[model samples]
Target: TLSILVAHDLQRVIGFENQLPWHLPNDLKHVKKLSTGHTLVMGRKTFESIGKPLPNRRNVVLTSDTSFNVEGVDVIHSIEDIYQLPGHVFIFGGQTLFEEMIDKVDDMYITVIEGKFRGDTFFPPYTFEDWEVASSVEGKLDEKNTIPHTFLHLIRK
Candidate 1:
């Protein structure tokens, strides 16, 4: 099964300058808990932004360059390679990868931020008609991160 794991603002802004625009430790913790033992398939740029292979997870990076290599990480030439793998796979991003896999993904776990943000990258647009919200948790403003957020589990219908 394939799932997209991402966090975005009301405008679907995901990143600014190849990095996350907000500092939300809880979001990071949620990602860690969900993706710990899963295979993470991401674009080369996303992998580069992360700096190194994440611990306790299989890191698969998509790159057109056959020579692009990272020690302890699997480098594949196409997004199709990720689908060939067994078990749960998460499409971790940099916009292009998400755009390519969005239609192919079965489920999405999105953390929706309550504010608008200025960013260079945005999550791909999709309509509510194509998906049904399976579950959601109403978020509260906390001292650590003042921006309210909601965690939603959506399944393509």
Candidate 2:
């Protein structure tokens, strides 16, 4: 099954300038936790934003560039490329990939940050309202993670 894994601020802003607007170590850790056993299918921009391949997880980058030279990642050129990649897939970021894969995805794992942030890239304004929350976990602030965020799992109802 296909899913989306993303974090957005209260304004539904994913990021701006291809970077996370906030530094939430816990959120990052949660991503690692959730993705440890699955294949991460991220857009080129999203993978670049994270800076490096997340260790110990399967990483596949979706991009049209044949020369997209990034070390340690399998490259896919299109959505159909999923047939070539390994493991259960998750559409893991950037607005472009989200919109493209939304129609085909069966579930969504959304991380909502309470702290207000500024970003030009907003998550897709599509059929999210039709999804139902399946589970939720709240992240409280800590020394490394100062912001409050809620991790949500949604399945299309």
Candidate 3:
């Protein structure tokens, strides 16, 4: 199945200077747990910012730069090639990959922070009429995370 795991602020800002602008431990934990045994597909920039392949998962990077390669990282030159991969393909998107994969995914998990934050990149705008809310929950409140956010699961209708 093709899916997405992404986070955004109130304005739909997802990134600032090629990295997330906020620190939310619960958000990180949620991603780590779900994607641990799945294949993670990301663009070159997103993969590079992550610094290394996330352990216990298949890390695939989609980029046109033929010279871009890394140990334990699979570099894919074509976006369409992703469809051939086996079960559980999760797009750990940056803005670029998110835009490319948005319409193709079956479902998405969006962490919607209730507060505003600085960002240079934003998630692509889309109408919710195309998807149905599968589930939604408020992130747990704790000292490790002060921001109030909701995790929304959207399945294509």
Candidate 4:
């Protein structure tokens, strides 16, 4: 199965200058918990933004440049290469890859933050009409992280 893991602010902002605008430890923990065992497919920019391969998960980078090389990560020139991978897959992003595979994922694990943030990149807009909320956790202010966020699991209808 395929899943998309994302976090966005009230303004639908997901990134600022190739980095997350806020430090939310709980959100990081949530991401690690969900994506650790799965294969992560991301754009070259996203891979670079992350800086290194996430331990335990197969990191796949989608890029046109075959010359792109990074230790411990797999570089694929085409989206078709993603489908050939075994086991659960998660499309981790830098916007472009998310737009390409939005309709293809079976589920979405989304974290919605309560505040507006300064961001240059936004999550692609999508209505709730095509998805059903499978589960949701109420927003919480964590001691480890000051941001109040709600985590949701949505399955495609």
Query: Number of backbone collisions per candidate, in order?
Result: 0, 0, 0, 0
RMSD of 4: 1.1
- In candidate 1, stretches whose alpha carbon ends up further than 4 angstroms from where it belongs are none
Residues 2-53, model 4: lDDT tens digits: 8999998999899999899888988888888988878989999998898999
lDDT of 3 by residue, 81-141 (tens): 9998887999887898899899999999899988899889888887789989999999988
Global local distance difference test of model 2? 0.85
lDDT of 1 at 54: 91
Listed in order, each prediction's TM-score against the native is 0.96, 0.91, 0.96, 0.95
lDDT of 4 at 100: 90
Better of 1 and 4 by lDDT: 1
**Model 2: per-residue Cα lDDT at residue 95:** 90
Question: 132 in model 4: Cα distance from truth in Å?
Answer: 0.2
Please list the residue runs of candidate 2 whose C-alpha ends up more than 4 Å from where it truly belongs after superposition. Answer: 126-129
Model 3 steric clash pairs: none
Largest TM-score belongs to which candidate? Answer: 3
Candidate 1 residue lDDT tens string, 57-156: 8898899987898887998897768879888999989699999999999999999988898899889999989999999996666888778889999999
